[PDB]
Amino acid sequence: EGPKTKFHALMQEQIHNEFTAAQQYVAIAVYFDSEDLPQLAKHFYSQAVEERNHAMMLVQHLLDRDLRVEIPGVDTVRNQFDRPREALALALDQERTVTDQVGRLTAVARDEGDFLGEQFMQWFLQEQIEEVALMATLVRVADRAGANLFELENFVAREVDVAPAASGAPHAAGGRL
Amino acid sequence: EGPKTKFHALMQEQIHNEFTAAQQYVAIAVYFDSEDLPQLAKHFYSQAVEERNHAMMLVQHLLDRDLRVEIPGVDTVRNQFDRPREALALALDQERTVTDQVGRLTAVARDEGDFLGEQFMQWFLQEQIEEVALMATLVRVADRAGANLFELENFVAREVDVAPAASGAPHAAGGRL
Amino acid sequence: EGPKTKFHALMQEQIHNEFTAAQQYVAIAVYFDSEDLPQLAKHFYSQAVEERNHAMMLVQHLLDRDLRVEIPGVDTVRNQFDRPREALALALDQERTVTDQVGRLTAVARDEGDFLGEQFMQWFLQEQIEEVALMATLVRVADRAGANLFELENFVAREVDVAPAASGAPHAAGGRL
Amino acid sequence: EGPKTKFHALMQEQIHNEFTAAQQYVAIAVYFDSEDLPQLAKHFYSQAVEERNHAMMLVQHLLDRDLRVEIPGVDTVRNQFDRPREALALALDQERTVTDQVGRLTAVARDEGDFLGEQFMQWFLQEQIEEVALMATLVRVADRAGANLFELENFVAREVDVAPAASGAPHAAGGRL
Amino acid sequence: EGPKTKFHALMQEQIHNEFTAAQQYVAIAVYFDSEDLPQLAKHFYSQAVEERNHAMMLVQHLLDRDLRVEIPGVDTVRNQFDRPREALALALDQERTVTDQVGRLTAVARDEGDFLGEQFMQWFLQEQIEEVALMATLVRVADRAGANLFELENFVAREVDVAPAASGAPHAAGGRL
Amino acid sequence: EGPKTKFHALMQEQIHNEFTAAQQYVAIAVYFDSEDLPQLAKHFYSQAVEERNHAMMLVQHLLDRDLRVEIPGVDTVRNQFDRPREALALALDQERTVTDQVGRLTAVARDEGDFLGEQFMQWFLQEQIEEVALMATLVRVADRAGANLFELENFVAREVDVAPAASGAPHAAGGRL
């Protein structure tokens, strides 16, 4: 209790960050749900679930290496939004922050010579590319729609496709939801 | 912002309590997972998911009545346990506390004359009976097994059965996981 | 317009290189086609298509990161060959050059601290191993066949197998052909 | 090397033109892709592929007549557009230019008394009618939609139908993609 | 014969190490077989086969890069064990040593600027995480079982699951067994 | 430890010999693989696997009689060959040597009055007939082909048939691969 490597410490923080991110995505979906944007709400419920899966993957990685892992609390998240665009903006900012965090985790792994950690990080880097692309798309399409939220909903219904999970995902503690 | 009924306030607290309970169940499952009790860990991963569903149901109820609902933070939960029995004890104590909370919610609904709330509460009362029974079973079987954790795992594998959800559950925001 | 990172610049050059490589593969296939080596021609038509897919993947990567991407021209390629071996040699030299280019792209990604780029590059490294192996095989088998082109064609028909794409390929702009 | 008929020369130029046209269609699709007009982008990715097929057909025709054929470079194409309409306009202008080119090829065939060439040209004339009609439709529908790009996308999704290739197409070198 | 890179040399040593590891796993399985622990013996026969596959993958990698590869001898392995736990301990120590070896191979690849080698190593890093986790589980469960070997066998039968190979494995010389 | 019968001792040596033979077959297959003789390489990968099975059968026989059995090391094998014929010659010489070894094992069994051993040996005698016949065929066909290795490969592809294992094989420790 005390000889924790930087990578171990950073991974525990990332588990906190991921659970917090999942909760923020839930808050955003509920906000959309209560503005009668079901398509957006459905998409973000899915996102909350997948963020939860990511946290479980970090947990599972710590279990597999027999490193001490704790399930954290969750910070309060944001529920007030003036307009749907502001919540899509928050989600884009969150995805970009997650990209930075995973990059920092990779860098710390490489610095400590923790090869296992570095390899494990690679899949998250890959997921981040696609996630950020989709959130940026949603933000741009929201700007184009402006006041007309129905067009935004129609774009989401036609163009935003739930993909069944590719293989290659790391195993999540408790199985991937 | 301010004319919130007691039932509305209490339901928002219950949403906080349920999310916290789900997180505590996750912590317990991870603890079991890292003690190599896969059967117990699998059961409690399921329990965490179902507690999450319950919180979503409370959320959905507030959405359906157009009452203000906020997704809360989550308190830190307990991760240290000296022995598996102590974690099964924590889970039993939590289920009993939840029974009290749902009973208090029912009582507050009845007091305010909120019939909709009272009816909605009924399903949770029903779920509590079965949940508490199962946790109490697990605690008694852990005592009987004592030091021999393999028997506990074998009991769980043979006797503890995931049931597909009966009908009659209230709808959960974002669909039941 | 001007703050382009080295990785962005290098990726745009690689898009030019890949389209050029696809066109050179087409030229080689047409050359084989007109020497009545259908098996070789069929193989290299496939190769041209797969190089095109690779270019589309680089394009898609730039789209996903919202980086400016331009579809380039294509340099003139080589059409004259004295003998089929000389064209298989050109193809081997091209595959090796591509290996260098992808390695340089990886190195530039690592240097700029562009983790997303580095991860994305990994799949191309992997494809290069197999591609170079197969081209080197074709060159050695051409030497062994010498003047007797029928044996070369028979080797290709029996031993060179189109594999359906494994999973794990990055997504190509416009879908993988 | 030097006794090339006008039809042979013109066909080699047309192969250059077709490859250039395919690349321009790719540039247009990528432009649409990066403006979040997936339906338009999908349509033009298809168009790029079909232009490539056309070039391959011209190649195959030269192979079948044992006429010298070279795979050319590709001119740089246009990537900047101020607004989607301007790119649909470019595509319409390109289809009309292609109609002129194929007509000139037919006329040159008839002039040299190259019956084989003339017959072969007929299928391209036929394809041009339909292609120009569709591009002109897209331009008119873009004008009607004006600023509202969502309507344009909806028109494309409902009304623009990929048809499986009719029979009667000439064979393409390397098989029709 | 003499300009061998460090990565080439280290890979040849790793091929020796992997074949030796496979043979040691066979010795362990035979030891379990002759102590009437069929479930453990079955698991370790599988492990021996999969270690053999790993060696074949390293071989295939050297074949694909046209690097000189030799099939080595195999060192004598350990057959005497005082108690099954001591053999599970040997297997855990071996898996950890393999993790170090693959990490050293990765580091040497990165040092020489051998990108192909580094990418190829990644899959082995990933396999090591899971393998070490499972061996550590077996050791802990053996300690918990103590003198009672039947519980150990029962844990293995219920909880240790042969997974069909995921995709993404590198190709093994002679096909994966 | 010391009252080992001649048959027991000889069987342990044979286990060493068989593992060595399997490794030599692997070396030969890899040699063929790296000369681009896939059909020969495939055949000898199969042979290596079947030699491994034979060693496992000898192991299993010692397990069934509760005789002490040790998994041995493996001698270094030959990897250099000047020409494919020289490796087919090595394989023929090895199969003939194995025939002698199994005959000596039978003779020693008969001498010690070990009926169980003698009966068990019979299946190996039978396998040797067919194996030697096939290797001798390959050598003669290689001589007939001479410099023209393609004919050798074609003979192997058409005439050398993997047969599913007949019944009557003795059981192999860890199941027959």
Side-chain angles (χ1 to χ4, degrees):
Chain A
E1 222 59 21
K4 265 184 310 315
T5 76
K6 278 137 129 57
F7 182 75
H8 187 179
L10 201 51
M11 280 270 301
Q12 181 63 60
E13 301 170 47
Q14 198 49 32
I15 284 172
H16 171 79
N17 286 336
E18 284 300 297
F19 279 124
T20 293
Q23 202 75 346
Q24 180 64 79
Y25 273 153
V26 168
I28 281 171
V30 170
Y31 166 72
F32 282 145
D33 215 294
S34 74
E35 298 295 337
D36 309 289
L37 309 159
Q39 304 297 317
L40 284 176
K42 170 148 80 69
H43 180 254
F44 275 92
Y45 286 125
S46 297
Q47 292 289 340
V49 168
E50 182 58 31
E51 268 329 271
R52 184 193 199 261
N53 295 328
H54 290 158
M56 290 332 262
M57 293 164 179
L58 303 179
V59 164
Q60 177 67 53
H61 183 79
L62 291 183
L63 291 164
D64 294 328
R65 299 186 56 192
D66 280 44
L67 294 182
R68 166 49 68 64
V69 49
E70 269 101 353
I71 301 304
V74 172
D75 306 325
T76 60
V77 294
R78 174 149 178 234
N79 290 278
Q80 297 306 70
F81 300 96
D82 297 324
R83 54 190 197 99
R85 201 253 189 226
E86 162 137 41
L88 303 167
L90 178 82
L92 173 61
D93 174 82
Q94 160 159 303
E95 282 309 340
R96 294 196 164 127
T97 290
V98 162
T99 304
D100 291 327
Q101 280 156 359
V102 171
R104 184 191 171 190
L105 266 162
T106 314
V108 165
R110 195 168 300 174
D111 215 50
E112 287 197 312
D114 185 349
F115 289 103
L116 294 184
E118 208 194 332
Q119 188 276 329
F120 170 74
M121 281 341 282
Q122 295 318 295
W123 187 86
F124 294 89
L125 290 169
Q126 167 201 262
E127 296 309 283
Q128 265 328 95
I129 287 141
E130 212 92 332
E131 272 301 296
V132 175
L134 171 57
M135 278 314 316
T137 294
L138 295 173
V139 176
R140 286 191 306 272
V141 173
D143 289 332
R144 172 159 95 226
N148 186 348
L149 298 170
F150 299 102
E151 299 315 331
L152 167 48
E153 282 271 288
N154 290 339
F155 185 92
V156 172
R158 185 168 61 229
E159 312 302 339
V160 172
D161 202 19
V162 175
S167 49
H171 177 72
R176 211 189 172 161
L177 313 180
Chain B
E1 222 59 21
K4 265 184 310 315
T5 76
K6 278 137 129 57
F7 182 75
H8 187 179
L10 201 51
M11 280 270 301
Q12 181 63 60
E13 301 170 47
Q14 198 49 32
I15 284 172
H16 171 79
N17 286 336
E18 284 300 297
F19 279 124
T20 293
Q23 202 75 346
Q24 180 64 79
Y25 273 153
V26 168
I28 281 171
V30 170
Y31 166 72
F32 282 145
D33 215 294
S34 74
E35 298 295 337
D36 309 289
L37 309 159
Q39 304 297 317
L40 284 176
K42 170 148 80 69
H43 180 254
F44 275 92
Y45 286 125
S46 297
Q47 292 289 340
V49 168
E50 182 58 31
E51 268 329 271
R52 184 193 199 261
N53 295 328
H54 290 158
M56 290 332 262
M57 293 164 179
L58 303 179
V59 164
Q60 177 67 53
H61 183 79
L62 291 183
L63 291 164
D64 294 328
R65 299 186 56 192
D66 280 44
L67 294 182
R68 166 49 68 64
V69 49
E70 269 101 353
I71 301 304
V74 172
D75 306 325
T76 60
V77 294
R78 174 149 178 234
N79 290 278
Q80 297 306 70
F81 300 96
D82 297 324
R83 54 190 197 99
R85 201 253 189 226
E86 162 137 41
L88 303 167
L90 178 82
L92 173 61
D93 174 82
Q94 160 159 303
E95 282 309 340
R96 294 196 164 127
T97 290
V98 162
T99 304
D100 291 327
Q101 280 156 359
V102 171
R104 184 191 171 190
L105 266 162
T106 314
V108 165
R110 195 168 300 174
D111 215 50
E112 287 197 312
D114 185 349
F115 289 103
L116 294 184
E118 208 194 332
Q119 188 276 329
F120 170 74
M121 281 341 282
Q122 295 318 295
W123 187 86
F124 294 89
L125 290 169
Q126 167 201 262
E127 296 309 283
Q128 265 328 95
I129 287 141
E130 212 92 332
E131 272 301 296
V132 175
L134 171 57
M135 278 314 316
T137 294
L138 295 173
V139 176
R140 286 191 306 272
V141 173
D143 289 332
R144 172 159 95 226
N148 186 348
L149 298 170
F150 299 102
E151 299 315 331
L152 167 48
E153 282 271 288
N154 290 339
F155 185 92
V156 172
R158 185 168 61 229
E159 312 302 339
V160 172
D161 202 19
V162 175
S167 49
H171 177 72
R176 211 189 172 161
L177 313 180
Chain C
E1 222 59 21
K4 265 184 310 315
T5 76
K6 278 137 129 57
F7 182 75
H8 187 179
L10 201 51
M11 280 270 301
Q12 181 63 60
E13 301 170 47
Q14 198 49 32
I15 284 172
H16 171 79
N17 286 336
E18 284 300 297
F19 279 124
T20 293
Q23 202 75 346
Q24 180 64 79
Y25 273 153
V26 168
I28 281 171
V30 170
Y31 166 72
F32 282 145
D33 215 294
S34 74
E35 298 295 337
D36 309 289
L37 309 159
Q39 304 297 317
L40 284 176
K42 170 148 80 69
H43 180 254
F44 275 92
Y45 286 125
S46 297
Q47 292 289 340
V49 168
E50 182 58 31
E51 268 329 271
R52 184 193 199 261
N53 295 328
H54 290 158
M56 290 332 262
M57 293 164 179
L58 303 179
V59 164
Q60 177 67 53
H61 183 79
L62 291 183
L63 291 164
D64 294 328
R65 299 186 56 192
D66 280 44
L67 294 182
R68 166 49 68 64
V69 49
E70 269 101 353
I71 301 304
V74 172
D75 306 325
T76 60
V77 294
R78 174 149 178 234
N79 290 278
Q80 297 306 70
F81 300 96
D82 297 324
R83 54 190 197 99
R85 201 253 189 226
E86 162 137 41
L88 303 167
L90 178 82
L92 173 61
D93 174 82
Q94 160 159 303
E95 282 309 340
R96 294 196 164 127
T97 290
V98 162
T99 304
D100 291 327
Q101 280 156 359
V102 171
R104 184 191 171 190
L105 266 162
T106 314
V108 165
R110 195 168 300 174
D111 215 50
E112 287 197 312
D114 185 349
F115 289 103
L116 294 184
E118 208 194 332
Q119 188 276 329
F120 170 74
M121 281 341 282
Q122 295 318 295
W123 187 86
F124 294 89
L125 290 169
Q126 167 201 262
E127 296 309 283
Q128 265 328 95
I129 287 141
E130 212 92 332
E131 272 301 296
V132 175
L134 171 57
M135 278 314 316
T137 294
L138 295 173
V139 176
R140 286 191 306 272
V141 173
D143 289 332
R144 172 159 95 226
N148 186 348
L149 298 170
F150 299 102
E151 299 315 331
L152 167 48
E153 282 271 288
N154 290 339
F155 185 92
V156 172
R158 185 168 61 229
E159 312 302 339
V160 172
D161 202 19
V162 175
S167 49
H171 177 72
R176 211 189 172 161
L177 313 180
Chain D
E1 222 59 21
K4 265 184 310 315
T5 76
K6 278 137 129 57
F7 182 75
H8 187 179
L10 201 51
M11 280 270 301
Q12 181 63 60
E13 301 170 47
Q14 198 49 32
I15 284 172
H16 171 79
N17 286 336
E18 284 300 297
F19 279 124
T20 293
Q23 202 75 346
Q24 180 64 79
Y25 273 153
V26 168
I28 281 171
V30 170
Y31 166 72
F32 282 145
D33 215 294
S34 74
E35 298 295 337
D36 309 289
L37 309 159
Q39 304 297 317
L40 284 176
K42 170 148 80 69
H43 180 254
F44 275 92
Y45 286 125
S46 297
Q47 292 289 340
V49 168
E50 182 58 31
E51 268 329 271
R52 184 193 199 261
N53 295 328
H54 290 158
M56 290 332 262
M57 293 164 179
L58 303 179
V59 164
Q60 177 67 53
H61 183 79
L62 291 183
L63 291 164
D64 294 328
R65 299 186 56 192
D66 280 44
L67 294 182
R68 166 49 68 64
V69 49
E70 269 101 353
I71 301 304
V74 172
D75 306 325
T76 60
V77 294
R78 174 149 178 234
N79 290 278
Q80 297 306 70
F81 300 96
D82 297 324
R83 54 190 197 99
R85 201 253 189 226
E86 162 137 41
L88 303 167
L90 178 82
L92 173 61
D93 174 82
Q94 160 159 303
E95 282 309 340
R96 294 196 164 127
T97 290
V98 162
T99 304
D100 291 327
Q101 280 156 359
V102 171
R104 184 191 171 190
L105 266 162
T106 314
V108 165
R110 195 168 300 174
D111 215 50
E112 287 197 312
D114 185 349
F115 289 103
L116 294 184
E118 208 194 332
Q119 188 276 329
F120 170 74
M121 281 341 282
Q122 295 318 295
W123 187 86
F124 294 89
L125 290 169
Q126 167 201 262
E127 296 309 283
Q128 265 328 95
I129 287 141
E130 212 92 332
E131 272 301 296
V132 175
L134 171 57
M135 278 314 316
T137 294
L138 295 173
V139 176
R140 286 191 306 272
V141 173
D143 289 332
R144 172 159 95 226
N148 186 348
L149 298 170
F150 299 102
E151 299 315 331
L152 167 48
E153 282 271 288
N154 290 339
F155 185 92
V156 172
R158 185 168 61 229
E159 312 302 339
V160 172
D161 202 19
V162 175
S167 49
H171 177 72
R176 211 189 172 161
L177 313 180
Chain E
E1 222 59 21
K4 265 184 310 315
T5 76
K6 278 137 129 57
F7 182 75
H8 187 179
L10 201 51
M11 280 270 301
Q12 181 63 60
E13 301 170 47
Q14 198 49 32
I15 284 172
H16 171 79
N17 286 336
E18 284 300 297
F19 279 124
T20 293
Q23 202 75 346
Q24 180 64 79
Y25 273 153
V26 168
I28 281 171
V30 170
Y31 166 72
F32 282 145
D33 215 294
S34 74
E35 298 295 337
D36 309 289
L37 309 159
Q39 304 297 317
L40 284 176
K42 170 148 80 69
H43 180 254
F44 275 92
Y45 286 125
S46 297
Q47 292 289 340
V49 168
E50 182 58 31
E51 268 329 271
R52 184 193 199 261
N53 295 328
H54 290 158
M56 290 332 262
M57 293 164 179
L58 303 179
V59 164
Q60 177 67 53
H61 183 79
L62 291 183
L63 291 164
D64 294 328
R65 299 186 56 192
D66 280 44
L67 294 182
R68 166 49 68 64
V69 49
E70 269 101 353
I71 301 304
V74 172
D75 306 325
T76 60
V77 294
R78 174 149 178 234
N79 290 278
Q80 297 306 70
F81 300 96
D82 297 324
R83 54 190 197 99
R85 201 253 189 226
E86 162 137 41
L88 303 167
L90 178 82
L92 173 61
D93 174 82
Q94 160 159 303
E95 282 309 340
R96 294 196 164 127
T97 290
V98 162
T99 304
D100 291 327
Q101 280 156 359
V102 171
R104 184 191 171 190
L105 266 162
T106 314
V108 165
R110 195 168 300 174
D111 215 50
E112 287 197 312
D114 185 349
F115 289 103
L116 294 184
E118 208 194 332
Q119 188 276 329
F120 170 74
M121 281 341 282
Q122 295 318 295
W123 187 86
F124 294 89
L125 290 169
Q126 167 201 262
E127 296 309 283
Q128 265 328 95
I129 287 141
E130 212 92 332
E131 272 301 296
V132 175
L134 171 57
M135 278 314 316
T137 294
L138 295 173
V139 176
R140 286 191 306 272
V141 173
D143 289 332
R144 172 159 95 226
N148 186 348
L149 298 170
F150 299 102
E151 299 315 331
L152 167 48
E153 282 271 288
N154 290 339
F155 185 92
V156 172
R158 185 168 61 229
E159 312 302 339
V160 172
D161 202 19
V162 175
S167 49
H171 177 72
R176 211 189 172 161
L177 313 180
Chain F
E1 222 59 21
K4 265 184 310 315
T5 76
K6 278 137 129 57
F7 182 75
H8 187 179
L10 201 51
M11 280 270 301
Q12 181 63 60
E13 301 170 47
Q14 198 49 32
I15 284 172
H16 171 79
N17 286 336
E18 284 300 297
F19 279 124
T20 293
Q23 202 75 346
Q24 180 64 79
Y25 273 153
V26 168
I28 281 171
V30 170
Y31 166 72
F32 282 145
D33 215 294
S34 74
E35 298 295 337
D36 309 289
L37 309 159
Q39 304 297 317
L40 284 176
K42 170 148 80 69
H43 180 254
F44 275 92
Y45 286 125
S46 297
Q47 292 289 340
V49 168
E50 182 58 31
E51 268 329 271
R52 184 193 199 261
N53 295 328
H54 290 158
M56 290 332 262
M57 293 164 179
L58 303 179
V59 164
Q60 177 67 53
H61 183 79
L62 291 183
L63 291 164
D64 294 328
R65 299 186 56 192
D66 280 44
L67 294 182
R68 166 49 68 64
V69 49
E70 269 101 353
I71 301 304
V74 172
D75 306 325
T76 60
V77 294
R78 174 149 178 234
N79 290 278
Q80 297 306 70
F81 300 96
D82 297 324
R83 54 190 197 99
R85 201 253 189 226
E86 162 137 41
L88 303 167
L90 178 82
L92 173 61
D93 174 82
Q94 160 159 303
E95 282 309 340
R96 294 196 164 127
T97 290
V98 162
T99 304
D100 291 327
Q101 280 156 359
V102 171
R104 184 191 171 190
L105 266 162
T106 314
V108 165
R110 195 168 300 174
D111 215 50
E112 287 197 312
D114 185 349
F115 289 103
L116 294 184
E118 208 194 332
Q119 188 276 329
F120 170 74
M121 281 341 282
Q122 295 318 295
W123 187 86
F124 294 89
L125 290 169
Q126 167 201 262
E127 296 309 283
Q128 265 328 95
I129 287 141
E130 212 92 332
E131 272 301 296
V132 175
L134 171 57
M135 278 314 316
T137 294
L138 295 173
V139 176
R140 286 191 306 272
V141 173
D143 289 332
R144 172 159 95 226
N148 186 348
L149 298 170
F150 299 102
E151 299 315 331
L152 167 48
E153 282 271 288
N154 290 339
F155 185 92
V156 172
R158 185 168 61 229
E159 312 302 339
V160 172
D161 202 19
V162 175
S167 49
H171 177 72
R176 211 189 172 161
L177 313 180

